[PDB]
Amino acid sequence: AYQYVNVVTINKVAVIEFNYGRKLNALSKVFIDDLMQALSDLNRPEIRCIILRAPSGSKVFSAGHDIHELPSGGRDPLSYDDPLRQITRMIQKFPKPIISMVEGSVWGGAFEMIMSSDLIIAASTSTFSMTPVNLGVPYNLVGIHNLTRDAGFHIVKELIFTASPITAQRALAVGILNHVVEVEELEDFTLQMAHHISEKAPLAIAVIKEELRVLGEAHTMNSDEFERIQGMRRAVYDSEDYQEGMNAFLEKRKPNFVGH
Amino acid sequence: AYQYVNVVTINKVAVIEFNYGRKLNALSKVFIDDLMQALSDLNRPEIRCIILRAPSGSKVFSAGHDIHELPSGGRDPLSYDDPLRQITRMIQKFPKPIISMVEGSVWGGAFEMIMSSDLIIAASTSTFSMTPVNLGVPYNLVGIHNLTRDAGFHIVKELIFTASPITAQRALAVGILNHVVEVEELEDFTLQMAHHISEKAPLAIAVIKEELRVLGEAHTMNSDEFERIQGMRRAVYDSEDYQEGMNAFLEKRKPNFVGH
Amino acid sequence: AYQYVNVVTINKVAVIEFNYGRKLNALSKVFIDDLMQALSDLNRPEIRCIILRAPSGSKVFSAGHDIHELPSGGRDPLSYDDPLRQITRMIQKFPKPIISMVEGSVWGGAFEMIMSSDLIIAASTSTFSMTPVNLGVPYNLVGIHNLTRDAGFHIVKELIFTASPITAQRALAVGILNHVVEVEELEDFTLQMAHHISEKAPLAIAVIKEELRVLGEAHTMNSDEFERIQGMRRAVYDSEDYQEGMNAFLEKRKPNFVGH
Amino acid sequence: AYQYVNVVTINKVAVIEFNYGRKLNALSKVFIDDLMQALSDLNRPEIRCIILRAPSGSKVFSAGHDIHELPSGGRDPLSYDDPLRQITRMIQKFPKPIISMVEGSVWGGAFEMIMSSDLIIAASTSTFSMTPVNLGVPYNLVGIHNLTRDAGFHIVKELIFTASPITAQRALAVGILNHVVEVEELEDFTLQMAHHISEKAPLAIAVIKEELRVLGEAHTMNSDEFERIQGMRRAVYDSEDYQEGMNAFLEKRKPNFVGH
Amino acid sequence: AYQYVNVVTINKVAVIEFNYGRKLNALSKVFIDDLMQALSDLNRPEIRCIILRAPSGSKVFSAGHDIHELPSGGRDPLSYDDPLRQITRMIQKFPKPIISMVEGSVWGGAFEMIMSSDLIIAASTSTFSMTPVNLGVPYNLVGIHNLTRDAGFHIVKELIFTASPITAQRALAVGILNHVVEVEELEDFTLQMAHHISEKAPLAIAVIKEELRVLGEAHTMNSDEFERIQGMRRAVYDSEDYQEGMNAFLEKRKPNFVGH
Amino acid sequence: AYQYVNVVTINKVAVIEFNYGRKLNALSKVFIDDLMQALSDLNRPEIRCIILRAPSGSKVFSAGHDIHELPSGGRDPLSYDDPLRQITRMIQKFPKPIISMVEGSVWGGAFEMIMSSDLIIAASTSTFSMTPVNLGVPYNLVGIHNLTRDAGFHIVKELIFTASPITAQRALAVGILNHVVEVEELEDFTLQMAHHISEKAPLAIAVIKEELRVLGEAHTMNSDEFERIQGMRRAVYDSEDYQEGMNAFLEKRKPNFVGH
Ligand SMILES: CC(C(=O)OCCNC(=O)CCNC(=O)[C@H](O)C(C)(C)COP(=O)(O)OP(=O)(O)OC[C@H]1O[C@@H](n2cnc3c(N)ncnc32)[C@H](O)[C@@H]1OP(=O)(O)O)=[N+]([O-])[O-]
Ligand SMILES: CC(C(=O)OCCNC(=O)CCNC(=O)[C@H](O)C(C)(C)COP(=O)(O)OP(=O)(O)OC[C@H]1O[C@@H](n2cnc3c(N)ncnc32)[C@H](O)[C@@H]1OP(=O)(O)O)=[N+]([O-])[O-]
Ligand SMILES: [K+]
Ligand code: NI
Ligand code: NI
Ligand code: NI
């Protein structure tokens, strides 16, 4: 068993339920490490499909990045082995389909985490936001790339530049979501689709998933461009605005951004 | 003339109509060779726009891959010079617009074929499925790439992982189709658009179509990533699951997939 | 002060209004040079969001390329330093969000210009046309790429191959627009969103916009493929049809295109 | 047979000898067209290796570009379908090895031509120069790339920026040549190697040559970078220096370049 | 201990000596499994440099790919999981320098194996041959790429198209070898350089080795290019010539290749 | 005038001579800023070729990075806007040839700096070392790439992993240098080559230099690969070994590296 997730297996379908309500499923390292161990434990031939969910009735799916752990003092908080970076890679490389089954509000990092999964099925009352511009966080290239494969550029720029929540109905209309259903039908609807997928050829599913992963990633640039972007990101991590954004969040006041 | 298609010219518009209804327009080599010969014959200055259709009233637009013609195992079923791979390249490189005018159900390789065309106009009763996971087929990279330029990744993954049919209305909503019209209006609506395009500058249409083709292919990877994918595909077409999927289709029974 | 635009700033938002209505805000060099000088003058820390608009009541937002300035005698009219090519680079590199606020009809180069901006908010009565196939112009690779990040390939090919106008409602459905509002709400809706964005962290917005720009351009090809495309574009600008297309537009008649 | 080349077949080896000594085997269209026809006619299973040579005793192997064929009004003489661009593609795509067997002096485009070939075996008295900076020519990307696969960057820059001739001995030392032999041994040495190659597996040789060709071309860039370089090339073709360079060559006088 | 290698440790340097003299150290699956197990066992902080060697006095360093383990026809002979493909990836990714210390003749896959290593130091009597065109084998893109990072294209094509051995002196001159020494001095010359490297910063060496590996592999192409190459390779491994090459090796006779 | 360089012009040739001998021309910010200002000031049409040199008789050409300019620990000394990273970009983008004329010993970042220049002409007594593995520095991707365009991979790895000096004669043999001259002839040999280059077409030289620069950069990878390398570099900067290497150099003792 796991301290911060609960796993149920129903024939070939596994359901990983978040059990980190004390921090509204914020992406703390101890929570992500249990999620990753639970997924790893389910990498077996007789499991064919995974569902990720918050507990039934939750008002919050996930509060996103744990801002108490998101480091300040000049260190990159979205480095390659930071937990959100590790779990998006693991979801994308996992040789079985991973369905995000969403009840409640989805924030920032948690939005990138469900976007990295294969299908999203949501309650009609679920809401979605992408929040780095609230804190002054320079989100990393891979993280931003994970948000560009479903809705168009103008829609993605609206979500990130405003940090405003969208409804499940709008998330469906712009192509983020697969299905929107009444919260009382959410579990039944998602399990029926997961059981259906689990009757199909798992080795064909795994290789087509991996072919889509590498095509998704196949936007290539030279070393100079990457080093230029990393220089820009470091200037943001070094800014007064980044300190102000983190402090304003921890102090629950409105930040005063000044552009240095 | 052609054994397996019928061609009509109306001013500058050519309509290539399938004539393989006894096999529900499955993509047998003999059918695809005729479709490619008809297209090549229509590469003339006086032809400005192509329409591909099934006969009026067809229940099945195309049953997709001829499963009899797939090599039984140990052999890549979607090699570069296999007929579906040849026709999709030919459609994409053809210097005139090609409009798929769809009445009936569209399956598997035939869904890839229409996705490779420039515009899709469909009857309100048409249905669309992508079926390789029903048989355990390791669909090839170029083939999967051809399904990713219209609908988002989560939608494409639902289509491929479930192999379930979608309606014309849902295909329109997610960005696969240009237009949905009542079946009685399908021929007139599509001919009106083709005659319209036929008065525009053909050399500008041809170079813009080619620019889009190159940009659409310009997802690049290193040799190791490609060879790693090919090794994964070979493990699938070497698998007992692939033989069981082919056999269950030919024997009209439900396959039992086990993951090797 | 500018001859061809008017700028109003309130707090952190700047509105750049076209003042070239006597030529339907055609993208003449004198107008684009003024737009670029006004943007450069607004690249200051206290400015956080830009709106581009035509005057209230405009029937035509922009007529697109000035056909009286398009090179005739064997010269590429969309070379790297042509004014449309310069303004789209400047908008995409600009470290503040740029919102296109659209009232009236949008044509050709002007459609590319608004697509290059970060968000589009349009009146319910606005219309959008992409017109190079009306003139026989071989649109350049960068320009075509700018049109492919919002709507899918089939939709983009319909817009370009037909040159037919689409409504704001359809432009919203296919993913081109962020929002459609009644024209009497257009300024208030856009100002509210622009002022909302200006309260967010500008250095995070700037680096995320630049990350999106780099990822969007990261469709790479070898020198041979680019030189092949250049040769195709040159044969179009050397074409009888290209001369006929320009001549027809000047003589206010319908072109007769013949395919050389 | 051919006006401008002579072909001798010895067992499985074909020797293509230039017959344009009147014009020092300058790369005139009529000469290159005959060279490409003779090569095409030798694409038969019983031919296994090609040797390209000047006649025995030639002082000049090839004088490079024909000045009398560069079409002024700025028009790019290194466009995709100009004769030298066509013959380098054809040599690189030719499914048999092509050995350049060099006696005499090699100039400019003829240096690019022999670099495009598979092996170079040269007389101890042969000499090599790359000459576009003598004329003010903006050599094209693919043409420059063809010069970068043998010697290192500093060496290539010395050859191009000086336009000075190098000895066979230096060309061997820096990795441009395979072998340097006394002129009396040049046919024996070259034919012994060609005959040896002709006993090897031709389908393996062809696919490995094509693998090397694609790996050699696999330096990829985005559309913006290509268009930028094209703009710089156009600026050189529009320059006063380019006119001066061509006029000085025609008037047999030293050019005076001024940097515009 | 290992059945097919012997390992010595001298301070911080490990020497892996082949013990498969009965097949002249041909790269059989069981030999490569022990070489890889010995490398994995040595991946410890107190080991800082590896030497690969054949036993003292060896006439044959390695006879290369085990021809008996190649498939009969119709199957890719150089698939991603093939032993040669596994060992070259493991050498390249190994976080310590691997020096090939060469006494005797080096053939085919064994030449690719030493080329994949970091440094090559060779006896003055050693020789080097690349032999797939002797057997009609379609070498893979990754394998060919591993041969292109030291000598120029003209030299590499000579080596592969001739399958002729070159001396240690010529291999030094063209950039393949670091050093050539008399055989009596080979062991202690190599150990002196490995001990010197072992005093340097191992984490710096590892990240620089990895940066060079990524840069070396960063020649990118699109899916269609790779699948076109793979189809050409399949025509070769399906050919009569491939069968003839395998049979000629088994019957110890000269192959008769015909080009199908 | 400049505090840290001396500039002499001889008609079209400019010679930038280091004036930082009391610190062995270490690459301190104040010294690089003066070199960059002196280059910027020579970017004039009447200047056609630059020579970089140390004063006549210098024992040390440049000692490389100023180790007394390491920033606050946990921080990258090879970030995009560090002076060495700035001047190598500026040399590579400079629209005139830059020749490194080397007398004395060349170390570390100074080796990268001369490698980034267009030609290197050296005294027979000059020596060359690449030194980051002496200190435990994770040299950055762009910096390593700048070392890979002249000599082959095996040679570069020997230089980097040994940090051992090589002679001028060995640097010529492996392709690093253009020419080696007796020290009394060095200045005149280098000036005659610079005057010769200055007679050639400057716009042709500039565009070919720029085309070589972008081809040399055109090794592309995806975001995940770049971020994975940055994670490894950061782990090296965070290591005990990195502290030990910098402290050892400051204290003039042998470092004790332990591999964490
Ligand atoms: C990637 C990224 C992010 O993900 O940024 C973080 C985005 N997240 C957010 O803005 C949401 C932050 N949380 C909230 O606004 C509220 O907690 C919401 C979700 C509306 C729920 O309000 P609520 O009144 O029901 O509950 P709270 O009392 O606020 O929260 C319940 C508990 O979870 C803690 N918590 C909630 N969100 C957290 C977060 N993101 N990080 C750390 N702790 C969090 C909170 O401190 C409290 O703990 P404690 O008892 O120790 O004080 N980014 O920056 O780009
Ligand atoms: C991507 C991919 C594919 O393209 O795979 C194949 C996907 N297609 C399918 O699964 C649909 C296969 N066909 C069917 O399911 C049924 O024929 C459907 C479409 C429901 C219609 O049924 P129906 O009762 O009306 O008609 P049928 O008798 O089944 O079919 C009419 C005739 O066409 C033949 N046929 C149908 N589908 C075929 C196929 N895919 N390949 C070869 N022959 C086929 C069938 O054997 C019959 O011939 P015969 O009379 O000689 O036996 N893939 O799997 O890799
Ligand atoms: K011909
Ligand atoms: Ni893309
Ligand atoms: Ni079994
Ligand atoms: Ni390269």
According to DSSP, the β-strands at F220-221 and A221-222 are antiparallel
Rounded-to-integer distance, Cα E206 and Cα A191, Å: 47
Chain F nearest C-alpha distance from A79 (Å): 7
- Establish whether residue A63 lines the binding site of ligand 1, counting it when its CB lies within 6 angstroms of any ligand atom: yes
DSSP-derived 3-state class of residue D102? strand
Rounded-to-integer distance, Cα B104 and Cα B232, Å: 35
Which residues does D9 contact at the CB level (< 8 Å), separation at least 6? D15, D47
Rounded-to-integer distance, Cα D64 and Cα D49, Å: 24
Determine which one of A65, A136, A143, A237 is catalytic.
Answer: A65
What does chain E come to in residues? 260
Q: Could you give the domains of chain A?
A: 1-184 (3.90.226.10), 202-260 (1.10.12.10)
Amino acid, single-letter form, for residue A65? H
With contact defined as beta carbons under 8 Å apart, do C243 and D165 qualify?
A: no
Amino acid, single-letter form, for residue F144? I
Chain A nearest C-alpha distance from B197 (Å): 27
For E214-249, give the DSSP string. HHHH--EEEHHHHHHHHHHHHHHHTSHHHHHHHHHH
Rounded-to-integer distance, Cα B257 and Cα B251, Å: 15
Rounded-to-integer distance, Cα C198 and Cα C200, Å: 5
The CA B259 to ligand 5 mean position distance, Å, reads 9
Among F140, F119, F129, smallest CA distance to F189 is for F119
DSSP-derived 3-state class of residue F169? helix
The CA D117 to ligand 3 mean position distance, Å, reads 21
Which ligand has the nearest atom to the CA of C145? Answer: 4
Phi/psi of residue A118, nearest 5 degrees? -85, -40
Chain E nearest C-alpha distance from C222 (Å): 8
Which residues does C184 contact at the CB level (< 8 Å), separation at least 6? none
- What is the Rg, in whole angstroms, of the alpha carbon atoms belonging to chain F? 18
Nearest CA to ligand 1 atom 32: A23
Rounded-to-integer distance, Cα C70 and Cα C131, Å: 14
- Establish whether residue A23 lines the binding site of ligand 1, counting it when its CB lies within 6 angstroms of any ligand atom: yes
- Establish whether residue A135 lines the binding site of ligand 1, counting it when its CB lies within 6 angstroms of any ligand atom: yes
With contact defined as beta carbons under 8 Å apart, do F121 and F100 qualify?
A: yes
Phi-psi region of B108 (alpha: psi -120 to 50; beta: other; left: phi over 0): left
Residues of F in contact with E149 (CB under 8 A): 152-153
Query: What residues are neighbours of ligand 5 (ion), with CB under 5 Å?
Result: B 240
Rounded-to-integer distance, Cα B209 and Cα B119, Å: 12
Residues of F in contact with B221 (CB under 8 A): 222
Which residues does B163 contact at the CB level (< 8 Å), separation at least 6? A200, B129, B130, B131, B132, B133, B134
Phi-psi region of E26 (alpha: psi -120 to 50; beta: other; left: phi over 0): beta
With contact defined as beta carbons under 8 Å apart, do C19 and C5 qualify?
A: yes
Which residues does A143 contact at the CB level (< 8 Å), separation at least 6? A78, A84, A85, A88, A112
Rounded-to-integer distance, Cα C250 and Cα C242, Å: 13
With contact defined as beta carbons under 8 Å apart, do D183 and A183 qualify?
A: no
For A97-153, give the DSSP string. -EEEEE-SEEETHHHHHHHHSSEEEEETT-EEE--HHHHT----HHHHHTTSSSS-H
Q: Listing from the earlier edge strand, what are the strands of the sheet with B127-129? A: B60-62, B105-107, B127-129, B166-167
Rounded-to-integer distance, Cα E128 and Cα E108, Å: 8
B139 is catalytic: yes
Cβ–Cβ contacts within 10 Å for residue F187, how many? 17
Residue carrying the six token digits 């040994």? F162
Phi-psi region of D252 (alpha: psi -120 to 50; beta: other; left: phi over 0): left
According to DSSP, the β-strands at E5-10 and E13-18 are antiparallel
**DSSP secondary structure letter of residue C221:** B
Whether the CB of E219 is below 8 Å from some CB of chain F: the reply is yes
Q: Select the residue of F76, F217, F234 nearest A79 (Cβ to Cβ).
A: F234
Whether the CB of F108 is below 8 Å from some CB of chain E: the reply is no
Rounded to whole angstroms, the maximal C-alpha distance in chain A is: 56
With contact defined as beta carbons under 8 Å apart, do B136 and A201 qualify?
A: yes
First-last CA distance in chain B: 47
**DSSP secondary structure letter of residue D71:** -
Rounded-to-integer distance, Cα A98 and Cα A96, Å: 6
The CA D38 to ligand 3 mean position distance, Å, reads 9
What does chain A come to in residues? 260
Instruction: Quote the tokens at residue D55.
Output: 């006649």
Instruction: Quote the tokens at residue D97.
Output: 């090895």
With contact defined as beta carbons under 8 Å apart, do E43 and E33 qualify?
A: no
Strand stretches in F27-151, DSSP E: 49-53, 60-62, 98-102, 105-107, 119-123, 127-129
What does chain C come to in residues? 260
State the method. X-ray
Q: Select the residue of B175, B200, B202 nearest C163 (Cβ to Cβ).
A: B200
H/E stretch holding B5 reads strand B5-10
Residue carrying the six token digits 């509210």? C192
Which ligand has the nearest atom to the CA of B260? Answer: 5
Among D153, E149, E215, D145, smallest CA distance to F175 is for D153
User: For a pocket test of ligand 2, which of B61, B67, B68, B162 has the largest count of ligand atoms closer than 8 A to its C-beta?
Assistant: B67
Cα C152 from chain centroid?
A: 18
DSSP-derived 3-state class of residue F27? coil
According to DSSP, the β-strands at B5-10 and B49-53 are unpaired
Rounded-to-integer distance, Cα A142 and Cα E141, Å: 28
Strand stretches in chain F, DSSP E: 5-10, 13-18, 49-53, 60-62, 98-102, 105-107, 119-123, 127-129, 166-167, 179-181, 220-221
Residues of B in contact with C235 (CB under 8 A): 203
E65 is in an annotated binding site: yes
Among A148, A105, A119, A146, smallest CA distance to A51 is for A119
Cα F36 from chain centroid?
A: 13
DSSP-derived 3-state class of residue E19? coil
Q: Select the residue of A215, A220, A223 nearest E220 (Cβ to Cβ).
A: A220
Determine which one of C139, C237, C242, C245 is catalytic.
Answer: C139
**DSSP secondary structure letter of residue B212:** H
With contact defined as beta carbons under 8 Å apart, do E27 and E78 qualify?
A: no
Chains that touch A (3 or more CB pairs under 8 A): B, C, E, F
First-last CA distance in chain A: 47
A168 is in an annotated binding site: no
Among A25, A140, A147, A39, smallest CA distance to A85 is for A140
B109 is catalytic: yes
Among A9, A16, A23, A19, smallest CA distance to A38 is for A16
- Establish whether residue A107 lines the binding site of ligand 1, counting it when its CB lies within 6 angstroms of any ligand atom: yes
Among E116, E106, E162, E117, smallest CA distance to E142 is for E116
- Establish whether residue A98 lines the binding site of ligand 1, counting it when its CB lies within 6 angstroms of any ligand atom: no
Instruction: Quote the tokens at residue D42.
Output: 């030798």
- Interchain pair C230, D234: CB under 8 A: no
Count how many Cα atoms sit within 13 Å of the Cα of residue E258 in the half-sphere of its side chain: 6
H/E stretch holding F4 reads none
Whether the CB of E223 is below 8 Å from some CB of chain C: the reply is no
Residues of E in contact with D118 (CB under 8 A): 154, 157, 161
What does chain D come to in residues? 260
Rounded-to-integer distance, Cα D173 and Cα D128, Å: 13
DSSP-derived 3-state class of residue A198? coil
Amino acid, single-letter form, for residue E158? E
Instruction: Quote the tokens at residue C147.
Output: 């049109």
- What is the Rg, in whole angstroms, of the alpha carbon atoms belonging to chain C? 18
Burial grade of F7 (CB within 10 A; 0-12, 13-18, 19 or more): middle
Burial grade of A253 (CB within 10 A; 0-12, 13-18, 19 or more): exposed
Chain D residue closest in CA terms to F211 = D141
Rounded-to-integer distance, Cα C222 and Cα D226, Å: 9
Q: How far is CA D185 from CA D7, D124, D181, E114, E163, in A?
A: 20, 10, 6, 34, 22
